């Protein structure tokens, strides 16, 4: 009866059902155009203490990471803000500074939006991006190797470091926090993905979770080798220092804003920090070190 | 220092350095990007039927697209829902959304949900046009038109704020005009053809006539006894002792159209009502200047 008593899958299965819509990172519309939306709500995604500028940058970067994962380039953006009437004007000004910087970087732009009073800060972004070839979650192919960009787990260690509310942090800890607060979309993988990926997508719910969506969505079965997983130096250090398993972070790190794509091994780029972690074969599910694994 | 002590937009557009911040026109043909927001406690109450709020989430955005001479194509709906919200509320919500999309002939291609203290509804819509009609194309010699009647949405919100158990029909028609408005998608062809200056009355006639006057360099002259008044508004007014005109001039959002073009071009099937003319170089009502 209540949204909470319904669970994860349950809610979306009803909406899609209600509308009877198979399209609910982006939605592909013809003209192609990639339509995307994301939300950052105070209390959940960030705190009012985090520098506004980084939140402004993130607002644009999250949407760009979805457009990018589908082989498209970010073009236009609509930013809707729910702000408490007693919010510092400087907060909003710094927020839009970060937004301007993200747009300058990714080469997209804000064209509109509106403001509404609210008990808490709610950030809702809309982004439109064009593509000459839609690359999604089903295109996988038998024989395909499985790659991921960058490293995994960083964003998770950073959120935990933030939750510790330390006064200051060591550098290795800062780089981790920055990866979670001011992430950079792999807009540098567009050419590669819009040209060689058979299957692609942004790792937003964590490796294991999204590799399933991948496997399921293309009737294929994926095999990943834990000791191939790209691990960063600060995640290693963070782990040793707070005694944890780097791997548990790479497999279940939630959103990392890195790409998870597939294509024949022959196509690795001489310039991208691409890392093969497994292979696409047979059919049905995802496996790690040989043992089936689920979220 | 604080938002209310501020005004704010002019600072944002600044920081971003934009002339662009009801639609933003980005051009082969033109795409019309628009966003609308409905927040519980402000735009509606959880006690209103969910289905109407759902229809309105789409309608508000379609009225803007319509106003610029465009047709609604794609929609993205993002919901901020409290985990304790009844599931039927969301289901009834999307029923109203599905109905609006079938009617206006556009669709929701996706969106994302988030947990929250209050129902926050954010909708994004994409439209298309052969020709963009804005708030600056007014032309000396143009008559000033509006669609439907004015002030209904205001009386309706006031009827709802009274939280009566039931209401006379005339009042129900008023309430529905505010809660389940219908975008003037029936004016598209006429707008996307004869409008030199169009726009959606979202802040009230006089307020948006300014934006019209100021943004075209022109000056507008409105006659109050030309303003289209619906019968239930009159009834409402006579009943609650108020001036129908004050409602027509300051009815806030009415989801109607305010457009301009030569009088020698009215349609034989649209409830178009001429209310003024375009001359000199501001806004006037019955010969008196008027400001929001």
UniProtKB/Swiss-Prot annotation, chain A:
InterPro entries: PurM-like_C_sf, PurM-like_N, PurM-like_N_sf, ThiL-like. Pfam families: AIRS (PF00586). ATP binds at residues 96, 113-114, 137, 204. SUPFAM superfamilies: PurM C-terminal domain-like (SSF56042), PurM N-terminal domain-like (SSF55326). Its EC number is 2.7.4.16. It comes from the Bacteria. Catalyzes the ATP-dependent phosphorylation of thiamine-monophosphate (TMP) to form thiamine-pyrophosphate (TPP), the active form of vitamin B1. This is Thiamine-monophosphate kinase. GO terms for biological process: thiamine biosynthetic process; thiamine diphosphate biosynthetic process. Mg(2+) 5 binds at residue 205. Mg(2+) 4 binds at residues 26, 36, 66. HAMAP family: TMP_kinase. It catalyses: thiamine phosphate + ATP = thiamine diphosphate + ADP. Substrate binds at residues 45, 255. Mg(2+) 3 binds at residues 26, 66, 202. Mg(2+) 1 binds at residues 37-38, 114. The keyword Ligase does not apply. Mg(2+) 2 binds at residues 38, 66.
